[PDB]
Amino acid sequence: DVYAQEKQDFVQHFSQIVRVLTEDEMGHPEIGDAIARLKEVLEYNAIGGKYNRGLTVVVAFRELVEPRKQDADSLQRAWTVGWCVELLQAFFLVADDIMDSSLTRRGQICWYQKPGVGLDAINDANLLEACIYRLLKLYCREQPYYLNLIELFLQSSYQTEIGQTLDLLTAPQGNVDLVRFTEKRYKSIVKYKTAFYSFYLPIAAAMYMAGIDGEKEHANAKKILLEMGEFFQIQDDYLDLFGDPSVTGKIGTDIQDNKCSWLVVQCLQRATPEQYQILKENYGQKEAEKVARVKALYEELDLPAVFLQYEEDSYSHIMALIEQYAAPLPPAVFLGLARKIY
Amino acid sequence: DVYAQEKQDFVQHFSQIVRVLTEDEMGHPEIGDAIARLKEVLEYNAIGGKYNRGLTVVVAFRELVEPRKQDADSLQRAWTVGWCVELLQAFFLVADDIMDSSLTRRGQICWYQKPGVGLDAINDANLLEACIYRLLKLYCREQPYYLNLIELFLQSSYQTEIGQTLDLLTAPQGNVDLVRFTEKRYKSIVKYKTAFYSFYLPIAAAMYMAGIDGEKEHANAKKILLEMGEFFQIQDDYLDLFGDPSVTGKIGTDIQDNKCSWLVVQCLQRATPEQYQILKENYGQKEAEKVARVKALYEELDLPAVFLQYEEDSYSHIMALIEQYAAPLPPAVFLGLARKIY
Numbered sequence A, B: 001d002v003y004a005q006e007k008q009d010f011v012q013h014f015s016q017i018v019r020v021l022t023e024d025e026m027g028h029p030e031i032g033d034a035i036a037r038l039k040e041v042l043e044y045n046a047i048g049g050k051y052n053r054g055l056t057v058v059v060a061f062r063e064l065v066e067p068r069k070q071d072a073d074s075l076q077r078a079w080t081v082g083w084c085v086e087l088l089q090a091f092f093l094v095a096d097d098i099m100d101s102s103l104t105r106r107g108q109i110c111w112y113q114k115p116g117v118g119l120d121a122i123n124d125a126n127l128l129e130a131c132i133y134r135l136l137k138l139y140c141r142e143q144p145y146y147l148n149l150i151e152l153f154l155q156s157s158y159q160t161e162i163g164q165t166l167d168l169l170t171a172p173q174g175n176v177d178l179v180r181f182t183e184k185r186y187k188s189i190v191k192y193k194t195a196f197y198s199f200y201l202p203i204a205a206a207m208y209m210a211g212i213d214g215e216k217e218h219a220n221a222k223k224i225l226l227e228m229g230e231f232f233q234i235q236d237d238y239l240d241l242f243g244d245p246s247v248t249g250k251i252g253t254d255i256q257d258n259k260c261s262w263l264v265v266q267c268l269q270r271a272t273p274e275q276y277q278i279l280k281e282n283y284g285q286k287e288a289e290k291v292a293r294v295k296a297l298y299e300e301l302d303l304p305a306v307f308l309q310y311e312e313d314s315y316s317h318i319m320a321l322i323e324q325y326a327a328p329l330p331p332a333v334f335l336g337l338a339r340k341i342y
Ligand SMILES: O=P(O)(O)C(Nc1cncc(-c2ccc(OC3CC3)cc2)c1)P(=O)(O)O
Pocket: A091, A092, A093, A095, A096, A097, A100, A160, A161, A164, A167, A193, A194, A236, A240, B122, B123, B126
């Protein structure tokens, strides 16, 4: 597994990231305390996940750059850009966990729930975002791809934010409207909130670093990657209720938060009138017994089986897209990523 | 007054900003509802202030670009970049108002306090930030200053965020430590949280648009502008307690929020032991009668008089800095801005 193989060098590069994002400001001692908070923020919120998004930059870089061009410095830049993706994820999750009223993340209490943090986490999240552009400047300003990367990160953030807006719009608190939860709406939400940044961004970043900047190449890659990302968000939704939190590292809130989850969409597609009313009466509310009734209804409708069938069909479809669209990139770039997520 | 003179054309350019930040996504109808929320967000949070930061870009542009180079399109770009500064301010204020537990802003309820908004405002604030880079791309991508502007905005955001971190660190909730509130610490906080983005950013943006990209020119401008910005934040702190909210458009929260305000710093400098204990017992707490005791102590110490004397000395100092550092830029660039704020 090329990911488990690159993981150790990638993870060890973190203290170098933290050191340069502190060292860069030691010529201004007056911001010492702020920089110390930044370090706490990075340590708590950028470490402890699987690193799949950042590692995808590194793995793809190795597979797209001619081995003779992979010198020490280029590899440093690839690990930094990987870490930029992870910092973006860290920004996103800190803010998302506040907006979703989440409890735990990567097996520890959400940053905003720590005593003494609370809504100061809004600023911390944004500092994580700023660090991306500081690293890009420090490591990539002289490279021909510098502006492509800055623009890719900004664009990906805008897309992701538009997706979060749809997520939040489709899920008003205290307001049960199941008529909004359609398959068409679900697909749009997950394309924007998740697929672009989790799948397109890291590969595209590696493509740009390899000098692959053509509009058609990027469009073909994106065809595969946005579909992979849709599957990934369906799986996240499934695991929100049916996943083991000792493995997922977090407690699900989608039912309580009135979310347009893939589960509720599949539920509505299959439910009788009587089952629809049950869902209506119990969805979107904090009460544990109401949530349990929703989970029981999903179990009654065999949604776990439906998901396992979906995962098989999705995997086959993604593989067919790789056959259609991978060239001229090595298919391994996409296969290695599919292996991680399926 | 050159500001009141440019204000109308600037403010009318807003519906064009809103139209291009909607029109740009009409080739993706699936995000319609998100774009509609974005429009509400822009209307509520980018309109109703004095527009001093955005107008400074426009005024400076007119004074720094040779009149023969001020064609229709360049002026559009100057109004857009002005609006970028205002969108940055909109991002900042939406998030700040949440973190400060504020009630009103520009004479209406804070966006996050509207029923149905609440912490979804975290995402709205970030969308405002994303819009900056979308406008820069749409209007300035072909210009030689495009990367300078992207980098200036990102840098200014990072500085501002580091300043907000210090603000929040120096003001822990439920925790009265007046020993932290020193003059040295106060200056650092306000340089970073306010001076860079409110004063340096808009002028620098105009400088870059005029092709003035030299490190020394920018450093000289910054010497004036960071001091102006310190004065501006002292004044904001004074008005937080002593300003008329029908004029400021907002209710102050600095005492309740345990802030390192210029007022509390001046208070500590002058207070007897007995007055120190009063401050200690009453600062940083929600109770209206405690806040009132703090205000009474500041009045007992003639802090309003101290502020009026400060404003006179600061104005003279800023004018002396303009004499030292304005050349070769027209002094009017700095004088017009000083006139607005003093
Ligand atoms: O990991 P989680 O299951 O919490 C998922 N988290 C997730 C997935 N995709 C995008 C985001 C995201 C991105 C930006 C956000 O806010 C921007 C201002 C920060 C919030 C959330 C968050 P979700 O809540 O969608 O089920």
